[PDB]
Amino acid sequence: HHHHHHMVDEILKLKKEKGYIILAHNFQIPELQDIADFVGDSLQLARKAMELSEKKILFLGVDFMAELVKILNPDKKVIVPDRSATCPMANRLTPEIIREYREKFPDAPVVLYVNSTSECKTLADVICTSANAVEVVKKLDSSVVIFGPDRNLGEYVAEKTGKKVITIPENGHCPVHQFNAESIDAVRKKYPDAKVIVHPECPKPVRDKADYVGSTGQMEKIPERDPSRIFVIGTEIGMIHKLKKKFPDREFVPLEMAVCVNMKKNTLENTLHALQTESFEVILPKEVIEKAKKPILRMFELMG
Ligand code: SF4
Ligand SMILES: [Cl-]
Structure with a gap:
């Protein structure tokens, strides 16, 4: 509308003006996804955290991921709009x-x-x-x-x-991913050619009835190889927006409506305010950064 328009415009000017890169998780509201420089899953955010050039990062997600970004960038400034955003x-x-x-x-x-x-x-x-x-x-x-x-x-x-x-x-x-398996039964009836994609945080009965189980990053890749017209999505609601934007030619149907209240704590308003004040800084004890980087870097070593 008109008020969201002013906030959006200022966010983009301030980010540019101050040397911020904005990183967002896939569960952030559509309005924040739309203003981020990079939106992805936890793994993609971690990899991005290692290769970005900017000296300051505005992070839109939950505390543990903001802190990961900080651990991998101890000499850069990492801020979040709301410190209570947690898992x-x-x-x-x-x-x-x-x-x-x-x-x-x-x-x-x-x-x-x-x-x-x-x-x-x-x-x-x-x-x-x-x-x-x-x-x-x-x-x-x-x-x-x-x-x-x-x-x-x-x-x-x-x-x-x-x-x-x-x-x-x-x-x-995760309470957000506690879908009922009966929802998959029902959606099979309603759309017998839809492919069902769920997160591995979902309970076993839900996982077992899905066509695909994967991270949200993996979900966003499935339509590159599966031609299905309709996909049913068992993760947090914010992923639907991301999927619809990536593949406007397909239909994405929530398995059920599921919202992560913590992920919704970031808003245009508090995001703008964060850039205005350059706060709240993510700060960790030096010992914790030293000791926690080990297993994080080990993850990438055991990968490919
Ligand atoms: S959806 Fe929210 S509550 Fe569930 S695992 Fe992700 S951050 Fe945690
Ligand atoms: Cl496959």
């Missing part, structure tokens, strides 16, 4: 729990999903995202691993690798 699943794994399980299952490497606190990362042998979890866990020599905080992704990794995956905490899961 509730991630926050239930603690350093005390990792220590507990390391003592309970000595020998086993600790693999942490990128949705994890930066302090938890310092204790990990290696980090993974949904895109590379299976690959990463295969290259570890141990046949037993400790994995968290997502039980669903861990269980997915166990199925694919055949390795024993001890998940922590007890019931770590």
